[PDB]
From a paper:
The split barrel-like fold is characterized by a central six-stranded antiparallel β barrel in a Greek key topology with four α helices: A at the N terminus (the putative helix removed for [name] structure determination), B after an extended loop between strands β3 and β4, and C and D between strands β5 and β6. The identification of these residues and the lack of classic catalytic residues in the active site suggest that [name] functions primarily by precisely orienting PA-824 for efficient direct hydride transfer from F420 and potentially through additional transition-state stabilization.
Well-dispersed signals for 113 of 114 nonproline residues were observed by 1H-15N-HSQC NMR spectroscopy for uniformly 15N-labeled NΔ30 [name] protein, suggesting a well-defined three-dimensional structure. As expected (Manjunatha et al., 2006a; Taylor et al., 2010), the backbone trace shows high similarity to proteins in the split barrel-like family of flavin-binding proteins. All but the first five amino-terminal residues could be built into the electron density for both crystal forms (36–151 and 39–151, respectively). The asymmetric units (ASUs) for the Apo-1 and Apo-2 crystals both contain single molecules with similar structures (root-mean-square deviation [rmsd] is 0.96 Å). In Apo-1, the side chain of Y136 is flipped away from the F420 binding site, with the oxygen atom moving 19 Å relative to the Holo-1 structure.
Residue numbers in the entry: 36 to 151
């Protein structure tokens, strides 16, 4: 039950710009890569809705993603509903800690597409 992670769980470091500060903030997140896109997500919503990184990128879509030692400059947007339903099962399959197949239906769980 290692899913798709083998012996190393993949995590991306997302840098967003503070919506009040205009200074960078970094957050480790699970992700998928889909061609040139990087999809990032949180696994919890409800009390954890609207984390700072998400609010930052809603205000300013320019982000950086570091995966291993690769650094990408990307632009972020919400996954559309179709994309939520398409990518969430892939995240469930990849990561053993993502277990609820239907959590994509809860809009308080952010799912963000970062593209070039």
């Amino acid at each position: 039950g290692l899913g798709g992670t083998f012996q190393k769980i993949p995590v991306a470091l997302l840098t967003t710009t503070g919506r009040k500060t205009g200074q960078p903030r970094v957050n480790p997140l699970y992700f998928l890569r889909d061609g040139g896109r990087v999809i990032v997500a949180a696994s919890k919503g409800g009390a954890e809705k609207n984390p700072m990184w998400y609010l930052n990128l809603k205000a300013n879509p320019k982000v950086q993603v570091q995966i291993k030692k690769e650094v990408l400059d990307l632009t972020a947007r919400d996954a559309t509903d179709e994309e939520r339903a398409e990518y969430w099962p892939q995240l469930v399959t990849m990561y053993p800690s993502y277990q609820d197949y239907q959590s994509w239906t809860d809009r308080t769980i952010p799912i963000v597409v970062c593209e070039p």
